[PDB]
Structures are given as C-alpha cells and as structure tokens.
Amino acid sequence: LPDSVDWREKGCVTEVKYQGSCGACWAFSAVGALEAQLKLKTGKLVTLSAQNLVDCSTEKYGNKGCNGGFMTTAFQYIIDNKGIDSDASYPYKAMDQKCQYDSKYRAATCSKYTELPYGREDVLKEAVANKGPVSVGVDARHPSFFLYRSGVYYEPSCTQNVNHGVLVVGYGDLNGKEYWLVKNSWGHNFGEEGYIRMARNKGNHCGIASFPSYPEI
Numbered sequence: 001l002p003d004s005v006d007w008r009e010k011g012c013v014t015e016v017k018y019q020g021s022c023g024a025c026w027a028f029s030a031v032g033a034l035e036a037q038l039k040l041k042t043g044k045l046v047t048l049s050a051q052n053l054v055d056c057s058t059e060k061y062g063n064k065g066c067n068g069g070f071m072t073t074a075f076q077y078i079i080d081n082k083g084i085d086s087d088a089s090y091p092y093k094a095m096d097q098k099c100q101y102d103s104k105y106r107a108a109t110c111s112k113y114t115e116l117p118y119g120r121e122d123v124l125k126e127a128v129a130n131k132g133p134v135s136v137g138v139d140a141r142h143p144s145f146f147l148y149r150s151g152v153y154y155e156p157s158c159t160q161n162v163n164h165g166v167l168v169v170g171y172g173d174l175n176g177k178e179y180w181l182v183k184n185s186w187g188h189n190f191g192e193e194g195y196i197r198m199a200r201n202k203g204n205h206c207g208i209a210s211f212p213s214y215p216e217i
C-alpha cells in the first residue's frame with residue numbers, strides 16, 4: 001500500500017464547509033464521502049447537499065437534523081430516495097427545514113455502503129488507499145480539538161468513544177509521526193485550512209477507526 005495518500009491531489013475533495021451552530025457534522029461527512037465517489041465515477045467534482053440530509057434523512061433514519069445523526073443512515077436515505085441534490089440547488093442553512101428534495105436537481109446516487117471492522121486502522125488504511133475517502137466518527141469532546149492549529153494531533157485524554165463525524169481523505173507521516181488526514185466541517189479557519197492530522201497507529205486514537213464507512217455509486 002502507498003505510504004502516503006491525499007485524495008485532495010486527485011481532485012476528489014470539495015471545499016471545506018462550515019456547519020455553524022448546527023450539529024450537521026454527520027451530513028457533511030456523508031456527502032464528503034459520496035462527493036469523492038462521484039468524482040471517481042463521473043470525472044466531475046460537485047458539492048452535494050448536506051442540508052438535503054438534514055431536512056430529509058430524519059426519524060426513519062434515526063437522525064435528528066441539527067441535533068445529530070449517522071453517516072450510515074444518511075447513505076441509506078440516499079439509497080432509498082434514489083438520489084441527493086447538489087449543494088448549489090439545495091444550500092446549507094444550518095437549520096432544520098422541511099424536506100424539499102427535488103429529483104430535477106439530483107447530482108448523485110448511492111447503491112450501497114460498506115462498514116469497516118471496529119478499531120482496525122490497517123483495514124481503514126487499505127480502504128482509504130484503494131476505495132477513497134472514508135466517513136468516521138472521532139472523539140472531539142476535548143477542548144484541544146477545536147484549538148488544534150497544526151502538526152499531528154495527539155490528545156492523551158482521548159478515548160475510543162466517538163461523537164463527531166468527519167472524513168478521512170488521506171494518511172501519511174510528519175517526520176515519523178504517522179497520521180490520518182481528516183477533513184472537518186468547521187470552516188477554512190479551523191486547523192490546517194480546515195483539516196486536522198490525527199495520530200495514526202496509536203491504538204485507535206480518538207476512536208478514528210471505531211466506525212468507518214464509505215458509500216459506492
């Protein structure tokens with residue numbers, strides 16, 4: 001397997017988004033994963049509607065809009081719905097709204113999704129190298145997480161009990177410190193232009209490999 005991967009270099013990652021005061025991290029992680037598959041399958045990079053997920057993948061999917069949700073059930077909604085709209089046609093408002101999905105603006109579909117084995121960083125590495133960006137949950141309930149600025153993030157208080165959905169878009173090592181390249185949804189001002197490099201192969205640090213999943217078109 002390659003020693004380093006960065007899907008941004010292959011044009012498979014859209015601009016970093018900003019969720020604001022809405023807990024839509026799960027929606028952003030899910031569309032981020034599908035946006036990469038869309039680029040790989042059609043040759044075009046389009047940001048997909050996180051709002052579509054927030055407004056439409058609700059109770060039936062165990063999701064609570066701005067109060068939280070799951071990437072896996074978001075993918076199921078896209079499968080059941082037979083599509084998800086473009087972000088351009090269905091903009092993010094950081095608020096719970098009525099469902100306004102319209103197939104006229106469908107920008108992608110999802111036929112299935114895959115869940116990786118609990119805590120296996122080696123399997124996660126393979127998937128990121130061979131399949132593409134992977135949605136994961138991390139333990140971000142530590143003030144050091146939002147205050148992260150650069151380098152490889154390591155928080156001794158972290159645990160494997162996850163609560164924040166993000167997207168792994170690569171991996172590598174910074175002078176010997178292995179890491180996962182993670183795209184967040186806290187805007188361009190967070191971390192390294194919207195990304196955080198999290199410790200890799202350090203005992204499933206922050207639970208990054210606890211619940212990984214990726215969709216396929």
Ligand SMILES: *C(=O)[C@H](CSCc1ccccc1)NC(=O)[C@H](Cc1ccccc1)NC(=O)N1CCOCC1
Nearest residue numbers: 021022023024025026067068069137162163164165
């Ligand atoms: C992402 O932004 C959120 C935080 S929800 C709490 C909150 C914080 C700040 C403002 C408003 C609300 N997290 C989630 O959406 C997580 C994502 C996730 C996915 C997979 C594994 C771990 C975590 N999901 C949840 O918090 N919930 C899922 C649905 O029931 C409600 C809780």
